[PDB]
């Protein structure tokens, strides 16, 4: 599976990033990096179909990306979850959006990958880092072919960030294309793209 990005400019009214041409392959994680404000979110929201490209095209296995929305999982940089739902019910619900039925054991395997133990606790009782860990576990349960994660380990303790991200990426890169954003290059990502190269 290949995602082809050709001559891409992204933005709302005016372009913030331009001339992006790359081939993204299943199994090779792409990290788009730079300081907050450079256009990471805008780029990732365009790849995810939420935003229309200003120029260029994004084609997945020969088909326009907008025709394969059901195959895309996008995790935004914000942490917004239903506060009265349990961890396990949230995971079941996210999977159900993709028509996937998960049992409590598949749920626990995903939570184990991010070192979260209590399935029963309501999300509103958890810390932001813990909630982000649960969101990352949810990515492991869907049948998506394209994973686009904006600031995936936001809010997670600095000394735990890399352990968690590596754990997630190791699973997701076997399932599909993975694109993430961050503030720095990552040794464990196959492709690092500094967005300064494309900045207007
Ligand atoms: Cl940004
Ligand atoms: Cl944490
Ligand atoms: Na609770």
Ligand nearest to the CA of 123: 3
79 CA → ligand 3 middle, Å: 18
Compute the distance between CA of residue 80 and CA of residue 60 in angstroms, rounded to an integer.
29
Question: How many other CB atoms are there within 10 angstroms of residue 114's CB atom?
Answer: 24
Compute the distance between CA of residue 36 and CA of residue 57 in angstroms, rounded to an integer.
24
Q: At what angle do helices 161-175 and 104-113 cross, to 10 degrees?
A: 130
190 CA → ligand 1 middle, Å: 21
Compute the distance between CA of residue 98 and CA of residue 60 in angstroms, rounded to an integer.
19
Compute the distance between CA of residue 129 and CA of residue 200 in angstroms, rounded to an integer.
33
Compute the distance between CA of residue 181 and CA of residue 34 in angstroms, rounded to an integer.
8
Determine the longest span between alpha carbons in the chain, in angstroms: 48
Ligand nearest to the CA of 154: 2
129 CA → ligand 2 middle, Å: 4
Question: How many other CB atoms are there within 10 angstroms of residue 49's CB atom?
Answer: 19
194 CA → ligand 2 middle, Å: 27
3-state secondary structure of 68: coil
Is the Cα dihedral 139, 66, 9, 37 positive or negative?
negative
| Method of structure determination | X-ray
Q: Would strands 72-75 and 146-150 be described as parallel, antiparallel, or unpaired?
A: parallel
**How many angstroms from the chain centroid is the CA of residue 48?**
9
Compute the distance between CA of residue 98 and CA of residue 182 in angstroms, rounded to an integer.
26
Q: How far is CA 68 from CA 3, 27, 62, in A?
A: 12, 19, 11
84 CA → ligand 3 middle, Å: 8
134 CA → ligand 1 middle, Å: 23
Query: In CATH, what number is assigned to the domain containing residue 65?
Result: 3.40.50.300
Question: What is the domain range of residue 137?
Answer: 1-200
Compute the distance between CA of residue 39 and CA of residue 195 in angstroms, rounded to an integer.
8
Number of domains composing the chain: 1
The H-assigned helical ranges of the chain are: 40-47, 87-97, 104-113, 128-139, 161-175
Q: Would strands 30-33 and 191-194 be described as parallel, antiparallel, or unpaired?
A: parallel
């Amino acid at each position: 599976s290949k995602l082809e990005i050709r001559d891409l400019s992204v933005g709302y009214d005016k372009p913030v990033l331009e001339r992006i041409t790359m081939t993204i392959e299943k199994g090779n994680v792409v990290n788009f990096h730079g300081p907050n404000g450079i256009g990471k979110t805008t780029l990732l929201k365009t790849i995810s179909t939420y935003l229309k490209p200003l120029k260029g095209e994004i084609i997945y296995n020969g088909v326009p990306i907008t025709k394969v929305k059901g195959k895309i999982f996008f995790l935004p940089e914000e942490i917004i979850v239903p506060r009265k739902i349990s961890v396990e019910d949230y995971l079941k619900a996210v999977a159900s959006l993709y028509g996937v039925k998960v049992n409590k054991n598949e749920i626990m395997d995903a939570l184990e990958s991010v070192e979260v133990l209590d399935l029963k606790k309501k999300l509103g009782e958890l810390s932001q880092g813990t909630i982000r860990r649960v969101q990352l576990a949810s990515t492991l349960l869907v049948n998506a072919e394209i994973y686009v994660l904006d600031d995936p380990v936001v809010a997670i303790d600095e000394d735990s960030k890399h352990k968690v991200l590596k754990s997630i990426l190791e699973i997701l890169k076997e399932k599909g294309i993975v694109i993430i954003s961050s503030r720095e290059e990552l040794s464990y990502c196959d492709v690092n793209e500094n967005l300064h190269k494309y900045s207007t």
